[model samples]
Target: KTHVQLSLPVLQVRDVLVRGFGDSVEEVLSEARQHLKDGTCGLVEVEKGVLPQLEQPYVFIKRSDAAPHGHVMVELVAELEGIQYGRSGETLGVLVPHVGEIPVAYRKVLLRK
Candidate 1:
């Protein structure tokens, strides 16, 4: 079996809406990096040609006050990738009509090849 490594960016928002905000973007990203290195956050591939999104069960960094003012009702941002952050609904893949910012919060995503 061949293990093909795919390079993808990740954006996680440790929803501070109901939980209350207490950290900054830099802090959250740092903590995430730790989780990635320690194995707490399991790793998975995006299947075929699907654009990456906040995977199911996602918790990202925290900030006292910064970007994102709306309810954490489905916000997605690509920190590593060169994508803008915005509210998205139902994630999209390469085969789908993905041509602009999504408008809903998504815990999982679907991709097409």
Candidate 2:
């Protein structure tokens, strides 16, 4: 299967949000949030995130759009992977992995083609 990879922008270990979801949240949140418009974006509620420990980054994504109720919610398709430090291999966060992010909404088969 073709894998879609998203990357977090330039950030230091210190500038990253390091609590709650922690580094993994920050790392993958960055990646998950790429190209997303927040003015229309709503709350990103993480569900069923997988992680063995901290420092490893998880991955997830969503489409940011303003709803009729003035709430910003991400329209997500498939999922990406969680957050991880490529340089040193550190566990930072948990996220939806690749099979989860495959543009599912667009990929649905209404009938046999």
Candidate 3:
């Protein structure tokens, strides 16, 4: 069996902070890997609302009658952030520092003040 040697996946804040994301070093590598890749300028889309609409654990609630909103919602925090500088001098990013940890990405997400 031919095994393909892959560069052990590593996420470093230096890779992010060099671009001026945050001062939190090394703590957001995982989130960085999830939100950003070597090429794709995507993002970790976080949906947040009252009590929890998004940015929570990946879960599906259940009920006695299979009601969509009747099951207990598992509380989770939005922990992923990202940013990108466009050719037009535009910048955008997101921050959700909770369970998944905040990862800086190249897209946008719901921001709360």
TM-score of each prediction: 0.24, 0.22, 0.18
Q: Write the per-residue lDDT of candidate 1 for residues 4-109, one digit (tens) a residue.
A: 1121222122221122111444443344444333433222223443224333222222222222233122222223234333334433211111122222333231
Write down the RMSD of candidate 3 (Cα, Å).
16.5
Considering TM-score, which of the candidate structures 1 and 2 is the better prediction for this target?
Answer: 1
Model 3 score (lDDT) = 0.24
Which scores better on lDDT, 2 or 3?
A: 2
If the candidates were sorted by their TM-score against the true structure, best first, what order would they fall in? 1, 2, 3
Worst 10 residues of 1 by lDDT: 13-22
lDDT per residue for candidate 3 within 1-113, as digits (tens), equals 11111111112222322222233323343343333323222222323432133232221111111112222111112233333111121112222222332344232122110
User: For residues 1-77, what per-residue lDDT tens digits would candidate 2 score against the true structure?
Assistant: 12222232222223234311224444445544443222111112233532232234434233332232332232332
Give RMSD to native, each candidate.
16.4, 15.5, 16.5
Question: Residue 16 deviation, candidate 3, in Å?
Answer: 23
| CA lDDT of every candidate | 0.26, 0.28, 0.24
| Per-residue lDDT value at 112 in model 2 | 7
* Worst window of 10 by summed lDDT in candidate 2: 104-113
